[PDB]
Write a protein that binds this ligand. Structure first.
Ligand code: ANP
Ligand code: ANP
Ligand code: MG
Ligand code: MG
Lengths: 177, 177
């Protein structure tokens, strides 16, 4: 039900045009996204975590230096696809919230791609299994992730079907329907 | 041959008493150890790396925020075995040099244990296979490492056989003889 309400928030972010007022490629902008999706649902919406977390055998950036890491991550360049993916990979390693990192940071990635390349990821055609494998591998080698995403870019960045079917797939990655 | 010369340096560190002049539990003290073992052998002896490195599927702390991470890691408490191991685990995640992290940081760990608990690890009885597995797991859960090391502590901290057979085993962990 938390997931269902945040899915409505995600849809409203785009329907309302509020997506166009989110700061692009910064820590604050990621926090804006997270606050929009999870405000009133998670107590920690928008807030940088103070606890440590791991998933599938990988420990995300230690909370004691997470703030410092985010200051450096947000300054990374965004000129090319390769640089943008590298920045995304580091933001994923940071994993700045207790929950909802995946959904918020994918929206954050699309904004950076859209601003710098005039493209976004056509998530509806990006397999859950291949996406999750590629993300798990990305800290060591982002080849899997680059191969996957580059083949699924679209320049039709405001198309309703791409946007809304993409949001649905994004939520599916986290286990919702 | 680099390994053989640094093994002589490691032995001399203890034989000479120079070990007693190394700063305990700090980043600078780890750099002193590394400089002592590898000075004149690696160009980067004592120097915090600027490149990224991974091993066995784990990416060590990103070079762009490594300095910041080390400032926080060195401030971690050292009062109990559990705290000391937690500090060691984070220093291993930092992996501040291009090479020689294992050998230098194990000496660094013994100094912290010796200062705070009046014990050191009896490395000669600590299996290579179990040690390397336990270190690989430690970022997610340090249970393996704690179980292994706690069973192999000794209060005979200046005993020549414990020290020199321990150095030999430490070098063996890295693949030397
Ligand atoms: N072992 C791992 N290493 C690196 N990244 C991972 C790992 N496991 C999961 N991830 C990423 O972390 C994200 C999940 O973080 P989480 O805070 O659960 O976000 P979410 O929005 O709640 N769920 P999701 O829809 O899966 O992104 C996923 O998008 C994965 O790509
Ligand atoms: N996948 C991993 N995750 C976490 N730590 C690891 C991993 N692989 C190796 N290590 C640790 O990293 C150390 C090796 O770092 P390195 O810079 O090669 O030091 P070294 O002194 O040259 N060799 P060693 O004698 O094995 O410690 C080892 O002591 C391991 O315990
Ligand atoms: Mg989640
Ligand atoms: Mg080595």
């Amino acid at each position: 039900s938390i997931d269902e309400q945040s899915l409505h928030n995600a849809r409203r972010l785009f329907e309302s045009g509020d997506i166009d007022r989110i700061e692009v490629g910064t820590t604050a902008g990621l926090q804006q996204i997270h606050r929009y999706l999870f405000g009133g649902l998670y107590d920690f919406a928008g807030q940088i975590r103070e606890d440590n977390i791991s998933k599938g055998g990988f420990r995300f950036a230690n909370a004691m230096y997470l703030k410092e890491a985010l200051v450096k991550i947000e300054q990374m360049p965004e000129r090319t696809f390769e640089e943008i993916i590298a920045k995304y990979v580091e933001m994923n390693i940071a994993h700045p919230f207790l929950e909802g990192n995946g959904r918020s940071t994918r929206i954050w990635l699309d904004l950076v791609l859209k601003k710098n390349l005039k493209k976004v990821v056509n998530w509806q055609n990006v397999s859950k299994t291949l996406y999750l494998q590629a993300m798990e591998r990305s800290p060591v080698n982002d080849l899997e992730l680059r191969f996957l995403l580059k083949d699924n870019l679209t320049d039709d960045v405001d198309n309703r079907e791409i946007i809304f079917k993409g949001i649905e797939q994004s939520y599916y990655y986290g286990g919702y329907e």
